[PDB]
């Protein structure tokens, strides 16, 4: 289904699983990528993907933008490179779809989404100085699979 | 899914109304090539007969063999170029300036025109030469006229007058060529302008058919099958859709058929002669006995037997000239068999 | 901005409106140089291209006008030379100059001759297998040289097998 139906934030906070039943599980597999044994402070660089517009991105759009994003870091830095990527958001917002007529309008449960406010970091990678232009490219591919226009911000890195 | 089909009838010869002048009026004239001369002649249609020829085309495998070709007999008696007209180049097109007239007129030319008694050709000619010197002189045309009294089969004695262009040489030498024909009496035959075997353009007003329906007029389908017995036979399906809530002028409707001016292109002149060689036994149907100056035009020609037709050297020919064909046999058999 | 161009001893350039005519021992090249707020002038013996504005779009043309003048100077002194060599594989191609147009016959086995036209004054002269396009107006020469190569354009088949045609060998 087109994300045009769920991208906007207009429905109330519908997250309480003790009231909602038959919720489809997360399509996302890994929230912590790279070398999760090493710290984020052991890295000189911290480049994040900032969302410009206040959206509601689905678990499918999250998995897809995480996949081709991490798959560039596995391609360019190897299967065990010197990096650690992270997706700090989690899909809590349960979605509906009415599928009769308008009689009994409350739709059945179809999927999950994450409420992302403007200015927030969806993804945050921590890499080395030489591997930086590979991550600014892992994020150029990642923003094409989510709904908004994005900023790639360097939070640690005067090495240019 | 509603099979395609081209619209019924042409939308170029519009509107299909009655013609103003029964005498054809050209709107296009040939390009200037060599020798200065008149760009057109005129005659009266006589009828049809077949003629046997020798194939002139070098591209055809029939080159040299006998071939039967249909021919329209048109009597073309000598015309009189009674005047010369000049056009000044105005920002509004080509507007007329002045006319140079004669002294010797035809005994029965006062049946249509107000024949001049006191005219000044000299100073009018001066105005044309001053306009030529100025550089604003456009194209020079001659006021031609026919001699219907020369044709015994045509009841009309009242001359058909029409304008004809002169071109070929430089603007100076053709103005003078024109003036030279005029000062004599203007007598000119078909031999003067046309040579046999050449391609000409015959313009004529068609046969008058009165008011005819869509089927005949625009060649639309008659109602087919079951739809033919319900009370509708020669009437069309509809005058148009719901919206546009108006009937378009493009829809095949009833009206006046015939008496339209047509300019039939690339007509080959098969023979130009004099006497009684193309005449038919018992005379031509609804016309009469041909004896005198004529032309033999290949195929058909617009209009009925007795109507005035006009000639012009082909503005758009496809094949290269094959002058003077070997005309072996011309038929004389009666058209009443 | 302003750029002052020194005109050589063999060269003489005259101005009439926005038109520049450059005369010399090889010929006369007339050109029309026009663009917003740019004015070209002759300060006795120097060509001055000056405009009050310094924006990139204007700087693009001031630069283009300089190379249009500098190259007109070479046109009237030494001249422009483009060298061409006719190439054929199976068919005996004939390239003959007829009037104010260069003609190519029997190209790839065709009955119909392929004819272009010589732009302006330009001299196209053949020495057997070679051809040398020459003249003062680089605009006419470069185009007459191009017109010749382009006249043998084949889009219908593979150009890697069908390599027949005149090509440009020497670029000035």
């Amino acid at each position: 289904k087109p994300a045009s139906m769920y991208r906007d934030i207009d429905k109330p906070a519908y997250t309480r699983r003790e009231y909602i039943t038959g919720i489809p599980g997360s399509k996302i597999a890994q929230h912590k990528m790279g070398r999760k044994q090493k710290d984020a402070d052991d890295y000189p660089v911290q480049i994040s993907l900032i969302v410009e517009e206040t959206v509601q991105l689905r678990h499918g759009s999250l998995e897809a933008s995480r996949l081709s994003a991490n798959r560039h870091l596995i391609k360019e830095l190897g299967e065990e490179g010197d990096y650690k990527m992270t997706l700090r958001k989690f899909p809590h917002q349960v979605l509906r779809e009415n599928k009769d007529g308008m009689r009994a309008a409350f739709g059945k449960i179809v999927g999950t989404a994450a409420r992302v406010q403007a200015g927030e970091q969806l993804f945050t990678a921590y890499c080395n100085v030489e591997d930086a232009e590979h991550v600014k490219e892992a994020f150029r591919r990642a923003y094409n699979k989510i709904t908004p226009s994005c900023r790639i911000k360097v939070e640690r890195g005067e090495e240019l | 899914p509603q099979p395609s089909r081209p619209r019924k009838g042409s939308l170029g010869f519009g509107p299909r109304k009655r013609s103003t002048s029964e005498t054809p009026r050209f709107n296009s004239w040939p390009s200037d090539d060599g020798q200065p001369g008149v760009q057109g002649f005129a005659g009266y249609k006589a009828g049809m007969t077949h003629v046997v020829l020798v194939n002139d085309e070098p591209n055809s495998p029939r080159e040299g063999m006998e071939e039967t070709v249909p021919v329209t007999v048109i009597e073309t008696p000598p015309m009189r170029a009674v005047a010369l007209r000049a056009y000044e180049d105005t920002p509004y097109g080509q507007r007329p300036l002045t006319e140079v007239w004669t002294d010797e007129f035809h005994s029965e030319l006062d049946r249509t025109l107000d024949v001049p008694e006191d005219h000044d050709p000299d100073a009018a000619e001066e105005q044309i030469r001053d306009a030529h010197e100025a550089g604003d002189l456009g194209d020079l045309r001659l006021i031609t006229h026919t001699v219907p009294d020369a044709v015994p089969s045509v009841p009309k004695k009242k001359p058909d007058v029409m304008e004809t262009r002169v071109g070929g040489g430089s603007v100076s030498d053709r103005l003078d060529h024109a003036l030279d024909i005029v000062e004599d009496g203007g007598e000119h035959a078909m031999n003067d302008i046309f040579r046999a075997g050449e391609y000409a353009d015959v313009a004529g007003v068609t046969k008058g058919k009165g008011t005819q329906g869509p089927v005949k007029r625009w060649g639309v389908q008659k109602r087919k099958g079951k739809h033919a017995r319900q009370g509708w036979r020669r009437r069309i399906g509809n005058l148009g859709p719901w919206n546009p809530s108006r009937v378009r002028s493009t829809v095949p409707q009833q009206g006046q058929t015939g008496y339209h001016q047509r300019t039939e292109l690339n007509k080959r002149l098969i023979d130009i002669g004099e006497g009684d060689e193309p005449t038919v036994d018992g005379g031509f149907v609804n016309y009469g006995e041909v004896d005198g100056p004529y032309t033999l035009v290949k195929g058909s020609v617009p209009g009925p037997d007795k109507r005035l037709v006009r000639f012009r050297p082909a503005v758009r020919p496809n094949d290269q000239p094959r002058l003077d064909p070997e005309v072996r046999y011309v038929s004389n058999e009666s058209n009443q068999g | 901005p302003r750029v002052e161009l020194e005109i050589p001893e063999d060269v003489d350039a005259e101005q009439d409106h926005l038109d520049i005519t450059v005369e010399g021992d090889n010929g006369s090249v007339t050109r029309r140089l026009w663009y917003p707020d740019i004015d070209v002038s002759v300060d006795g013996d120097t060509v001055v291209i000056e405009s009050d504005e310094d924006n990139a779009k204007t700087m693009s043309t001031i630069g283009t006008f300089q190379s249009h003048i500098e190259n007109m100077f070479h046109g009237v002194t030494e001249g422009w030379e483009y060298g061409m060599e006719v190439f054929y594989s199976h068919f005996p191609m004939q390239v003959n100059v007829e009037g104010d147009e260069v003609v190519i016959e029997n190209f790839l086995g065709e009955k119909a001759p392929r004819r272009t036209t010589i732009h302006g004054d330009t001299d196209v002269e053949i020495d057997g297998e070679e051809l040398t396009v020459s003249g003062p107006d680089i605009e006419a020469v470069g185009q007459t040289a191009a017109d010749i190569e382009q006249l043998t354009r084949i889009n219908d088949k593979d150009v890697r097998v069908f390599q027949d045609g005149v090509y440009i060998t020497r670029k000035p």
Binding site: - | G93 | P36, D37
Partner: protein, 142 residues
Amino acid sequence: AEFDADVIVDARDCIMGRVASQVAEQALDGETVAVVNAERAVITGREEQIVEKYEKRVDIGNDNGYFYPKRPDGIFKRTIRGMLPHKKQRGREAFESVRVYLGNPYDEDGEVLDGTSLDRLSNIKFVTLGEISETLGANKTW
């Protein structure tokens, strides 16, 4: 042939609409205006887009009609009509006392009203009305 004009205007290198607007204003004041050298008039902008707009107006029409002039003669005369209430009493009399001419049928040179003139040395993107007319389908009679 003969027109007793109060004001005679020269359209040479003058921005069409701006001239038309001052000619329209004056027609309503009770002046007999005569626009001269219409072929030598001008319209600012990309040639390719100005032509598309004018070519479309020639394609537009039905059985009722929509006659749009091609000749630079009438193109000026119709733009003036678009600035005058030509369907009212007053507006018809004012429009009919304004005629546009190709070249100059008079001896007296026409004046160039203030603000209407274009600077060719400062501009390159414009078109001549006659250049539009040759592209529309007219015959160069000027």
